[PDB]
Design a protein around this ligand. Structure first.
Ligand SMILES: *Cc1c(COP(=O)(O)O)cnc(C)c1O
Ligand SMILES: *Cc1c(COP(=O)(O)O)cnc(C)c1O
Lengths: 384, 375
């Protein structure tokens, strides 16, 4: 007899996606929990608030009619119009509903942008410390990435000067995320105005991920929509996940030119089609809902963690938004987090995950009570 | 704007959709037989479970592959139906079967790889394959052969960069089911020449015959098989956007990566809804569709219309003389009945009628179609 053997190959691009530095640490935290350990988990990327009750009530009312059917792939007109009107009023712009595409979280708005704008080999400039999903998405879309590192000594502010220096012919977009995950910084108005100038001159799109724009602890937040006129070179990304603690609903959106929105809408349509109809109605109600209580709760947690860490001699840039604090650790950050987890049962995220080694990310989407206990344990750990 | 978006074939149906709405605005009584979704509500036990989940207020991120209990439920039902041992880690929950398909192409195709598809072909497959960087090779099937593909023709298109053959049975737009002997032959060819069979079985519940065979009836294991299904058609849950992919653990892991970085996890409410939907019987809806199928076949057959009797799904794909886009445009304008041109599925000279409507409305639409054909 004669034996033959077959390979079972997946696409090379899957390999090209960076490995998780984080999947083992989450499994470690969960395993400590399952054997009766008191793990304080400060790694969350989502608010610890429920969906606002008015949103629940509207979703239930819609649901009880029993009709959950396909919609326009770009989102129901009323949701697009509501989004267009809210963002338009906030930033004194005339946004048409046809400039908006409703997507499965801001995450799919981002992916759709890259797929809509990037030809194979096109380059996107990103700024580290950088959120974990951007690079995977750009890779999946056929693009390449130029990571521009920022520094704690510069308050993690990108250098406009240095950005122009890196522009090449293939540079199709510059991605900004303010307020920033994982640092919590908010980009300066002067930088953004300049970037908008660079985009007109040097012919590239600005993709702006502003999902944390409500969770601001300061009056210095500047949106790309504060410094732009029109959307010719702007892709604006937001959604309901952070602002309304609706992460599991998966509702976000993109606003750009009608041209880009149309392209993005084609991606949306052929990939997932329309998003969950219940979610669309939930989001439409969410537009009417005030999140002031949540934002103030996060502001006071931010103030508490900031004061506490300063006192312990820990080094960091004071976050002005989102719900992260990115602080400096001695040695290897992965090992820092492994040991703190195993010894103190506090879970943090290695800065390595965000391409900035020697740092750790703490989330303060938990009670002051739990934060106090965690910060206690961290202080003990820092003084062996 | 990326080149691939321009590579996407232009819609044949955009003007027609807009004309149907315009006619409605003008108070015209349009009978719209274009639907790709059942006309049933979400089953009430499903609604009740979704409501029960919702009222606790916690709608948060889950495992990007889908909650374990959902993956476990799906693995168990499919495994029990087809006498297979399926692990929950073989399953990825996705935003409809549509996203499972996209994720499969993204997970499997490198730039330039080929995928073979059969026309008449559902409108989203080719856009997806192009977005994923692939090229399409279309094998045409014929009414006189009950739209059953030639295995010889498939084989004659194979290259080293052929990564997949895509099958859709029961079929949209024809309603045919692929015979077992073809599927067995395909599985042999997939081993001989090293490609994946991607099987879109979303209509497998809506079958009016004993002759439906799944790719899982003819394959052993999942090393070359990508199985796609969901709740949209079986449970009339289209707007929930819940589907899934089952494959090898290696494929499912790659697909999980794509899901994770693109949309992440699906709507949490939808996941609990789908979990409950696994326990729900859809027999009443299937029997309703069967009776509608028998009625439309009988009526079209009597009026001398040529078509193959659908064996599944809720479409009938019949012959027309001339330009099928113009047929549909004129039928809509003159008789206020909406059909989809066969051209949209790469099969000119046909039109697609959907029977996701009541017999009363089907009766009236058919009267109008009979008049139109008899001038
Ligand atoms: C949470 C988050 C998002 C959006 O997530 P969705 O839940 O998909 O809306 C986008 N960017 C950053 C940096 C985030 O942290
Ligand atoms: C409706 C349909 C699907 C599934 O759509 P989802 O709503 O995304 O699950 C898949 N394939 C065909 C051929 C269809 O008609």
């Amino acid at each position: 007899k004669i034996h033959h053997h077959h390979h079972h190959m997946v696409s090379r691009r899957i390999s090209e996606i960076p490995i998780s530095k984080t999947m083992e640490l989450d499994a470690k935290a969960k395993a400590l929990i399952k054997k009766g350990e008191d793990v304080i988990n400060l790694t969350a990327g989502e608010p610890d608030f429920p969906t606002p009750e008015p949103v629940v009530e509207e979703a239930v009312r819609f649901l009880q009619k029993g009709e959950v059917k396909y919609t326009d792939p770009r989102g129901i007109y009323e949701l697009r119009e509501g989004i267009a009107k809210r963002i338009g009023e906030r930033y004194k712009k005339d946004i048409s509903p046809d400039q908006v595409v409703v997507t499965n979280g801001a995450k799919q708005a981002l992916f759709n942008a890259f797929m809509a704008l990037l030809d194979p080999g096109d380059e996107v400039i990103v700024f580290s410390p950088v959120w974990v999903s951007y690079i995977p998405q750009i890779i999946l879309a056929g693009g390449t990435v130029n990571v521009v590192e920022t520094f704690m000594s510069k308050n993690f502010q990108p250098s406009l000067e240095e950005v122009e220096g890196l522009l090449v012919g293939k540079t199709k977009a510059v991605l900004i995320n303010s307020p920033n995950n994982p640092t919590g910084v908010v980009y300066r108005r002067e930088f953004l105005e300049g970037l908008v100038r660079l985009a007109k001159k040097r012919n590239f799109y600005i993709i702006s991920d502003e999902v944390y724009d409500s969770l601001v602890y300061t009056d210095e937040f500047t949106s790309i929509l504060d410094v732009s006129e029109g959307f010719d070179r702007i892709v604006y990304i937001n959604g309901f996940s952070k602002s309304h603690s609706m992460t599991g609903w998966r509702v976000g959106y993109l606003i750009s030119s009608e041209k880009v929105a149309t392209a993005v809408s084609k991606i949306q349509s052929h990939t997932t089609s329309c998003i969950n109809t219940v979610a669309q109605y939930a989001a439409l109600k969410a537009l009417e809902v005030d999140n002031s209580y949540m934002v103030q709760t996060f502001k006071e947690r931010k103030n508490f963690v900031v004061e506490r860490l300063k006192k312990m001699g820990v080094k960091f840039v004071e976050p002005e938004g989102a719900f992260y604090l990115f602080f400096k650790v001695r040695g290897d950050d992965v090992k820092f987090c492994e040991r703190l987890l195993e010894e103190k049962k506090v879970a943090l995220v290695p800065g390595s995950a965000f391409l900035k080694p020697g740092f750790v990310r703490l989330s303060f989407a938990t009670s002051i009570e739990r934060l106090t206990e965690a910060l206690d344990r961290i202080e003990d750990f820092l003084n062996s």
